[PDB]
């Protein structure tokens, strides 16, 4: 109604110029569309490109879990693998990407001609039991690495006699266990092996000859850096767990120097972070440092290897009955029969579950945060100097979420003292960042924090999270 009818509109709109105006607007619209397309093309072509993927393997995407004594993992009186088949849910909840069985072959004493590396010990389990355990582990996406140490009941790592026949037995057993379906091998205390470099190179070549996802772990007892480098001279791809970090504890910058020197000497390759080849963390640390080390090991460029029960701070010096080499796992008050009532809830795994502040909750959160971001998976690592008693570094892959870890190894509280951000690389440090979690009571998370006025209580770790700049 509020407008011209058909006849009047066709009478008036036919005037010259009016026909040209709408045509001009149509051509202007098409020109603007073409200009928008050209601008989009220019923005696309003049843009940075992606970084190349590092060809991710299976063992780079999570920690590893070691089981030194299978009998004491589920308590005495139950040594069969069915305990592990039933307990796989616990490790799946922990979200580990590996599992290291202890030695299961026959080893009674130093008798070389009687010890065999292929036959499965009946007490530990059966061959079909091992196959069922492997199948269950594979279904749970938990891959199994099997240990091969011919002598673990006596004094020598391999045998006190000539070791060539030991190498022949090991090379015979490699395929027997490889076609069994295991996903990797482990050898320990190779410091007692004469000319161990050649044997390790041969085993690495053989294991890689079956498939590409096969892995080999070597464990030493020497903290010397030069010996480790000499061992890795011909075994670059080999993962070597050692006591390197065990030399010093609670050191503000000595630990940073150790880590930086090791990374510089190794050529920034992939390595394994652990305080000992087969021993627990509490055997070298007190109860006030477990959180700091568990935070450090989950944010370093490498594979972290932990011992069983060290996600809840198990102690081998708190109960006389349990031997130091084979601690008994604390599942309930009835787990340890001697002196009932000595076991407390806060050391019990069930007591550490519901409590948010428990070590087990911290371990679970770090495990969750380890295997989803690419920065912590295969990102670049840059450590920068800070105030005394502190260790500060940054993780950043190419463009994803950047992480910044600060640890206080000093015995007294002090400010952050971040001073100059040495080697920031592409990931510039902003004045504002998030705080995902803290290792001490207080310090509510989720809120942003200001770094220039960070007050650090003794023995505290921070895992600030900030995005691309």
């Amino acid at each position: 109604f509020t407008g011209l009818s058909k006849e009047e509109l066709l009478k008036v709109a036919g005037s010259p110029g009016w026909v040209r105006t709408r045509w001009a607007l149509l051509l202007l619209f098409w020109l603007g569309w073409l200009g928008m397309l050209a601008g989009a093309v220019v923005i696309i072509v003049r843009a940075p490109r992606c970084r190349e993927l590092p060809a991710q393997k299976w063992w780079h995407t999570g920690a590893l879990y070691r089981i030194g004594d299978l009998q004491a993992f589920q308590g005495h009186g139950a040594g069969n693998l069915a305990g592990l088949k039933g307990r796989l849910d616990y490790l799946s909840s922990l979200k580990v990407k590996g599992l290291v069985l202890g030695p299961i072959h026959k080893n009674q004493k130093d008798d070389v001609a009687q010890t065999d590396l292929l036959q499965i010990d009946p007490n530990f389990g059966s061959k079909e039991d091992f196959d069922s355990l492997l199948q269950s582990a594979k279904k749970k996406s938990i891959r199994v690495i099997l240990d091969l140490t011919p002598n673990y009941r006596g004094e020598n790592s391999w045998f006190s006699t000539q070791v060539d026949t030991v190498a022949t037995k090991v090379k015979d057993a490699l395929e027997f266990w490889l076609q069994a379906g295991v996903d990797g091998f482990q050898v320990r205390d190779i410091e007692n092996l004469k000319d161990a470099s050649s044997f390790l190179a041969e085993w690495q070549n053989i294991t890689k000859g079956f498939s590409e996802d096969r892995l080999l772990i070597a464990g030493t007892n020497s903290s010397d850096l030069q010996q480790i480098l000499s061992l890795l001279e011909s075994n670059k791809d080999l993962l070597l767990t050692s006591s390197y970090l065990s030399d010093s504890g609670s050191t503000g910058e000595h630990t940073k120097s150790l880590v930086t020197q090791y990374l510089n000497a190794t050529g920034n390759r992939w390595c394994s972070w652990s305080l000992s080849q087969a021993r627990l963390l509490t055997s070298f640390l007190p109860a006030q440092l477990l959180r700091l080390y568990q935070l450090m090991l989950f944010t370093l460029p490498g594979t972290p290897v932990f011992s069983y029960g060290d996600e809840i701070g198990l102690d081998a010096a708190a109960l006389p009955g349990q031997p130091m080499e084979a601690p008994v796992m604390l599942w309930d008050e009835s787990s340890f029969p001697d002196i009932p009532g000595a076991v407390s809830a806060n050391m019990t795994v069930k007591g550490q579950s519901e409590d948010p502040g428990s070590l087990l909750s911290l371990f679970r959160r770090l495990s969750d945060q380890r295997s989803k971001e690419r920065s912590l998976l295969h990102g670049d690592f840059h450590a920068f100097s800070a105030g005394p008693g502190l260790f500060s570094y940054i993780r950043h892959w190419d463009q994803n979420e950047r992480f910044l870890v600060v640890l206080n190894f000093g015995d007294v509280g002090l400010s952050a003292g971040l001073q100059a951000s040495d080697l920031p690389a592409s990931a510039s440090l902003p004045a504002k960042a998030d705080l995902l979690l803290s290792t001490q009571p207080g310090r509510e998370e989720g809120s942003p924090l200001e770094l220039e006025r960070l007050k650090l209580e003794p023995h505290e770790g921070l895992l600030l999270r900030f995005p691309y700049a």
């Binding site: 407008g3 058909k6 619209f29 992606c50």
Partner: protein
């Protein structure tokens, strides 16, 4: 001078198919597995969503057959109730939810089309915005050109979506044929994180996202041949096919990937293509991108004929009613829709619109069903050839009440504010409808503006 009926049965099915299957199948699996841990539970909730959509479409078909007036909820819910609720509905459609729908779908299209050029890197935001705006401009020009071109494009892109889904299904079947285990033991058995109200209702709420968009046939009624029989037939042909395709695609996804992979990754289709294809697995997002393109077109179509309908009732300015004498398309309505679709690009954030839509979309359907029941009670034999039993509508009303309760539980503060905006239309309603004897200068200015818009864009009144 009236819009002749051009949509046929095939185009009627194509509209629904291209509107419903735009993005949900390629993203939702991750969320439904996050809520429902067991893949069997996810399949069960998908089937439940499918049958719920079947029930809603069934009754909706009758509701549309009874009232052959053009326009969707704005017509059925205007004939029932009164003028005031209808204007609130149309104002809400005009303000946020409808214009934001096209922009969000176009942004998804841009991102998934530019993904092959930036596999791991996040695509630049400027390029995505420009590509989305280019898509909207091209589509609103094609729509203004002629109806037949729009119908042909919609049919072609629906066919492309079906072809991509069939490719996914055949790849899944092939990988089943290679001695697969179908992940049967994790399937069903332990449910995982099931709860009475904690998780199953959340999984249902996530599932109903991908099944939306079936309420579009009404928006194009009075433009299709023989609406009395072709409208219900198109719905009953389209919906079960979509349900079975969704179920089969979810089954194909679950069997060939680990649960944790979906729980961690986002683009399930990209991972499927990388695993199976292994070669040139970059077109997969491209197809998916195309799967969005046609969708936008459909929405734009179903948007324009909505606003035009409002302009017939006097709620809207009379500029929108006029149509081109030769082309016979409502040019001003399409231009207005394109303008307010473009205007949402300038927003820094775009996910804030879901908070209100999430409950508005599911309360309006319940209001429409209550109106249908009221119409049945008030006067019988109002040309109801179908005459469905009065059992589905009451169950649908009860289910919609549960959905509204779940929405209130999930986002109380967000839902509150969303509804407050609804009250903002009252001053506009009073100024436009309740206020009529305006000063002469206002009427002169309005008339001059409409005359100018008629002079630039050659459009004649409806009659």
């Amino acid at each position: 001078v009236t819009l002749q009926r051009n949509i046929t049965l095939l185009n009627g099915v194509a509209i629904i198919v291209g509107t419903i299957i735009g993005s949900g199948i390629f993203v939702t699996p991750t969320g439904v597995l996050k809520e429902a841990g067991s893949p069997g539970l996810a399949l069960v909730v998908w089937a439940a969503c499918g049958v719920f959509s079947i029930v809603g479409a069934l009754c909706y078909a009758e509701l549309g057959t009874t009232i052959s007036k053009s326009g969707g909820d704005y017509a059925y819910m205007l004939e029932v109730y009164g003028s005031l609720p209808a204007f609130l509905k149309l104002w809400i459609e005009l303000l946020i939810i409808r214009p934001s729908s096209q922009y969000i779908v176009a942004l998804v299209f841009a991102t998934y089309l530019l993904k092959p050029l930036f596999p791991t890197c996040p695509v630049p935001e400027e390029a995505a915005k420009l590509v989305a705006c280019l898509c909207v401009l091209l589509l609103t020009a094609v729509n203004c050109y002629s109806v037949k071109a729009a119908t042909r494009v919609q049919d072609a892109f629906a066919a492309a979506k079906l072809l991509a889904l069939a490719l996914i299904i055949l790849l899944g079947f092939v990988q089943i044929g290679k001695g697969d285990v179908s992940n049967l033991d994790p399937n069903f058995s332990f449910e995982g994180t099931k709860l009475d109200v904690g998780n199953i209702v959340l999984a249902l709420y996530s599932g109903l996202f991908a099944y939306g968009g079936w309420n579009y046939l009404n928006f194009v009624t009075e433009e299709m041949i023989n609406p009395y029989r072709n409208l219900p037939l198109a719905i009953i042909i389209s919906l079960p096919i979509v349900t079975l395709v969704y179920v089969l695609t979810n089954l194909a996804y679950f069997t060939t990937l680990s649960t944790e992979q979906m729980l961690s990754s986002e683009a399930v289709a990209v991972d499927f293509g990388n695993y199976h294809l292994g070669v040139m697995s970059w077109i997969i997002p491209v197809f998916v991108g195309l799967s969005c393109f046609g969708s936008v077109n459909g929405s734009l179509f179903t948007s324009s004929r909505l606003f035009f309908v409002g302009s017939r009732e006097g709620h809207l300015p009379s500029i929108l009613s006029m149509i081109h004498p030769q082309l016979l398309t409502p040019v001003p309505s399409l231009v207005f829709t394109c303008v307010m679709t473009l205007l949402y690009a300038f927003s820094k954030d775009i996910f804030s619109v879901i908070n209100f839509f999430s409950f508005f979309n599911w309360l309006c359907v319940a209001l429409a069903i209550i109106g249908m029941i009221w119409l049945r009670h008030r006067k019988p034999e109002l040309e109801r050839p179908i005459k469905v039993n009065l059992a589905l509508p009451v169950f649908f009303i009860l289910a919609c009440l549960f959905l509204i309760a779940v929405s209130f539980w999930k986002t109380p503060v967000e839902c509150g504010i969303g509804f407050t905006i609804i009250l903002s239309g009252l001053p506009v309603y009073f100024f436009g409808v309740w206020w009529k004897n305006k000063p002469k200068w206002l009427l002169q200015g309005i008339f001059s503006t409409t005359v100018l818009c008629q002079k630039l864009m050659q459009v004649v009144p409806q009659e």
